[PDB]
Structure formats: structure tokens, C-alpha cells
Design an enzyme around this catalytic site. Structure first.
Site, PDB file in Angstrom:
ATOM      1  NE  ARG A  55      -5.214  -4.766  -1.624  1.00 30.55           N
ATOM      2  CZ  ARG A  55      -4.405  -4.988  -0.597  1.00 30.55           C
ATOM      3  NH1 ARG A  55      -3.106  -5.183  -0.771  1.00 30.55           N
ATOM      4  NH2 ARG A  55      -4.910  -5.019   0.633  1.00 30.55           N
ATOM      5  CG  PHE A  60       1.116  -0.160  -8.753  1.00 32.92           C
ATOM      6  CD1 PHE A  60       2.471  -0.115  -8.479  1.00 32.92           C
ATOM      7  CD2 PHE A  60       0.390   1.009  -8.699  1.00 32.92           C
ATOM      8  CE1 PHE A  60       3.094   1.083  -8.178  1.00 32.92           C
ATOM      9  CE2 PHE A  60       1.011   2.217  -8.403  1.00 32.92           C
ATOM     10  CZ  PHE A  60       2.362   2.247  -8.135  1.00 32.92           C
ATOM     11  CD  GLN A  63      -3.680  -8.696  -3.500  1.00 30.22           C
ATOM     12  OE1 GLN A  63      -3.005  -7.678  -3.644  1.00 30.22           O
ATOM     13  NE2 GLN A  63      -3.879  -9.258  -2.307  1.00 30.22           N
ATOM     14  CG  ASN A 102       3.710 -12.775   0.876  1.00 34.46           C
ATOM     15  OD1 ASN A 102       3.784 -11.749   1.570  1.00 34.46           O
ATOM     16  ND2 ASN A 102       4.608 -13.084  -0.059  1.00 34.46           N
ATOM     17  CG  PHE A 113       0.365  -9.780  -7.361  1.00 32.56           C
ATOM     18  CD1 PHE A 113       0.873 -10.577  -6.337  1.00 32.56           C
ATOM     19  CD2 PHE A 113       1.245  -8.997  -8.091  1.00 32.56           C
ATOM     20  CE1 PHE A 113       2.244 -10.600  -6.049  1.00 32.56           C
ATOM     21  CE2 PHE A 113       2.629  -9.022  -7.818  1.00 32.56           C
ATOM     22  CZ  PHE A 113       3.118  -9.825  -6.805  1.00 32.56           C
ATOM     23  CG  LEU A 122       6.189  -6.472  -5.264  1.00 33.65           C
ATOM     24  CD1 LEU A 122       4.916  -6.793  -6.025  1.00 33.65           C
ATOM     25  CD2 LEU A 122       5.897  -6.196  -3.772  1.00 33.65           C
ATOM     26  CG  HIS A 126       5.151 -10.841  -3.147  1.00 38.56           C
ATOM     27  ND1 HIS A 126       3.887 -11.015  -2.629  1.00 38.56           N
ATOM     28  CD2 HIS A 126       5.672  -9.759  -2.521  1.00 38.56           C
ATOM     29  CE1 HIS A 126       3.645 -10.056  -1.749  1.00 38.56           C
ATOM     30  NE2 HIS A 126       4.717  -9.289  -1.656  1.00 38.56           N
TER      31      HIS A 126
END
Ligand SMILES: Nc1nc2c(ncn2[C@@H]2O[C@H](COP(=O)(O)OP(=O)(O)NP(=O)(O)O)[C@@H](O)[C@H]2O)c(=O)[nH]1
Ligand SMILES: [Mg+2]
Lengths: 164, 170
Positions: A55, A60, A63, A102, A113, A122, A126
Site C-alpha cells: 500500500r 502520505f 506501507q 495496526n 509504514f 496518527l 500508531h
């Protein structure tokens, strides 16, 4: 003791792209850093080598880390399938931050990531545990292969990994 | 001539939003779970003898990004609110989706259909009667579906189109 450094050799459809190295903040997040370190060396008999950045969303993050199901849903830690959020001391302050993916509170496994931008929303959800040391230009190059829904246009893999 | 409909599929993680959409669009089902970020589809169909162009926005079952999710609700014309019949929390989550849609669109009358998915499975925890009663309290249709067997899939999306049409022609 000194914070460990680990490396990923990134490949694109099997062709080398470059090496990314990370400082792991064992001094502040020891349990989470140790998981990532051991998964990078493969010393427990499983880990990141061969797995995919499944991903990648430009602007951004990149991942990866699913070495069990190979489809973005799996992964496991060296402590069991999941482990608790260790602390939220460190924040998502900008590009290069390394943080745990997660599925809600206390579900850390192996997915992680690398931020390519500040992702402050986040924070507190995270666990941040490292940062890119060398090879941010490689991470930026990986973005070329992502898209708005995260699907990648070529296979971006951790062809090799270990501890420096 | 045709008419176009902006449908948005919402519901908790894993209830079958994407499997329902893919069955409608592509007429197949896969048990592999591919968690959604965001996907959009277009398909031409005939509903009640009229040619319809369906725009379907398949949303993720996450709740964190309220700015984006509010825009989904502002633009969308009708909402498929999906829960899974073997996931009681997903059914309890439904009222939050209805409240958010009403708040964002500033209306107590928004086209929506309540969908209870996974009806092929032997592990039901939500009674059909309970879902029927909830839908009645909202004044909206309730449809039981299985993306695996295709039961109710066309009915769920086509009923939503009919709800938008009725709302627009009031
Ligand atoms: N037996 C059965 N399984 C179903 C049904 N609908 C979905 N599933 C399964 O349930 C899992 C999740 O389905 P999916 O459509 O991805 O759910 P989602 O609501 O889109 N999830 P997300 O919020 O992450 O996007 C998949 O393994 C899928 O095969 C159904 O009607 N019956
Ligand atoms: Mg989905």
C-alpha cells in the site's frame, strides 16, 4: 547501548532500486524496536525478507510488512500474533518516520509504514519507533509506483534485509 | 434517455461492502479480503424499465477521516448502510451512520436502505426481526443479502435507486 540500524534493499519487479536504512529507537521504544530489528534479520525463522510494500499512497506513506498472508491483511510479531502499544512518546513529525500499522488499539504485528509527509493525525494511535537514516531518495522513488487507493503499479519488495 | 444515481456504500469493516459492489458490477465473489481505501464504479442497468447509470462509491469501514467522509455524504444521493448478520457490533454501528448522514445532509429524509449481509452463513447473531424493526423506525427498506450467493444483491442496489427516485420526485 546504541540504537540499532537495519536496512532494506528495495526491488521493483525484482530489479534493485536502492537501500533504505533505519535507526530504531530502542532507547525509547525498546519492545517495538526489537520486534522490527528481529523481523529484519530473520533470526526467529520468519520476517520481512521477500515481502511487499502493498500500500503506497503518494503524499502520505509507504506501507508493508505482511509476510504471512502476502495480501495486506496479515503479519505477526516476535511476541505472538499481536502486541500492545508500547508508548506514544514519539510523534509523526515529517517524512521518514517509521511507525507501526495496526487494526486498532494493541494490535501491532509486523506491518509498518514509512511516512512521506507529516501525518500528525496518527499521533497517539500508531507507535513511532524509528526513522529513515539513509535512502530517503529511495522511499521517494517508491512513491512513483503508488496510487490514491494504495495499489502499486509494479511489485515493490524487500529483496534483502538485515542489521548493520 | 437515462438517469444517473450517486450511490454510496457504508458500514463497519468487513461486513461486505466491497463484495456486494463487486457482485453487482462484475458478477463474481471471492473469499479473499482486500481492505478498501476507496473505490468507485460505474455501471449501466435497467430498473423498472428505465435505463440507469449507477455511480457507486465503495467506502472503507473506518471512521477516522471525518472531512473526507462528510464530503462522501454531501455528494452522495443514496446510502446503502450495510451490516453483517453474524456481527452484532456492526448492527449496533448502523445508527451512527444514519445520524452522520442526517447531520451532514441536514435532513431527516435521506434515501437509504438497510442491508443485512452474509445471510448464507450459519453463525447469525442478529435476528431478521431486529433489523426489520430498526428499518421501520427509520422509515427505510431492509434487505437481507449474500454477496457469496448473490441473494438480494440486485434488490438492495435497485431498491436504493427507487428510494432516490421517489425522494427527487416528491
Ligand atoms: N460468506 C460470506 N462472506 C462474505 C460475504 N460478503 C463478504 N464476505 C467476506 O467477508 C470479507 C470482507 O468482505 P469485504 O467485501 O471486503 O468487506 P468490506 O465491508 O468491503 N471491508 P472494508 O471496510 O475493509 O472495506 C471477505 O473475506 C469476503 O469474502 C457474504 O455475503 N458471505
Ligand atoms: Mg471494502
Amino acid at each position: 547501548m546504541v540504537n540499532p540500524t537495519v536496512f532494506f534493499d528495495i526491488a521493483v519487479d525484482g530489479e534493485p532500486l536502492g537501500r533504505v536504512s533505519f535507526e530504531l529507537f530502542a532507547d525509547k521504544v525498546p519492545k517495538t524496536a526489537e520486534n522490527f530489528r528481529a523481523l529484519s534479520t530473520g533470526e526467529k525463522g520468519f520476517g520481512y525478507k521477500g515481502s511487499c510494500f502493498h500500500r503506497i499512497i503518494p503524499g502520505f506513506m509507504c506501507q508493508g510488512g505482511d509476510f504471512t498472508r502476502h495480501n495486506g491483511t496479515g503479519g505477526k510479531s516476535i511476541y505472538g500474533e499481536k502486541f500492545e502499544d508500547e508508548n506514544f512518546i514519539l510523534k509523526h513529525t515529517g517524512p521518514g518516520i517509521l511507525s507501526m500499522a495496526n487494526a486498532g488499539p494493541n494490535t501491532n504485528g509486523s506491518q509498518f509504514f514509512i511516512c512521506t509527509a507529516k501525518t500528525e493525525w496518527l499521533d497517539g494511535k500508531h507507535v513511532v519507533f524509528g526513522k529513515v537514516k539513509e535512502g530517503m531518495n529511495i522511499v521517494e522513488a517508491m512513491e512513483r509506483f503508488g496510487s490514491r487507493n494504495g495499489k502499486t503499479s509494479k511489485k515493490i519488495t524487500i529483496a534483502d534485509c538485515g542489521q548493520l | 434517455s437515462m438517469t444517473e444515481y450517486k450511490l454510496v456504500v457504508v458500514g463497519a469493516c468487513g461486513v461486505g461492502k466491497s463484495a456486494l459492489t463487486i457482485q453487482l458490477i462484475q458478477n463474481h465473489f471471492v473469499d479473499e479480503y482486500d481492505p478498501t481505501i476507496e473505490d468507485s464504479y460505474r455501471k449501466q442497468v435497467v430498473i423498472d424499465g428505465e435505463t440507469c447509470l449507477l455511480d457507486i462509491l465503495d467506502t472503507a469501514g473506518q471512521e477516522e477521516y471525518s472531512a473526507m467522509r462528510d464530503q462522501y455524504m454531501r455528494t452522495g444521493e443514496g446510502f446503502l448502510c450495510v451490516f453483517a448478520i453474524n456481527n452484532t457490533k456492526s448492527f449496533e454501528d448502523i445508527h451512527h451512520y444514519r445520524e452522520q448522514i442526517k447531520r451532514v445532509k441536514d435532513s431527516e429524509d435521506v434515501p437509504m436502505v438497510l442491508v443485512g449481509n452474509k445471510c448464507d452463513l450459519p453463525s447469525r447473531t442478529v435476528d431478521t426481526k431486529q433489523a426489520q424493526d430498526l428499518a421501520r423506525s427509520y422509515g427505510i427498506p431492509f434487505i437481507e443479502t449474500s454477496a457469496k450467493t448473490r441473494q438480494g444483491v440486485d434488490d438492495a442496489f435497485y431498491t436504493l435507486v427507487r428510494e432516490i427516485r421517489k425522494h427527487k420526485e416528491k
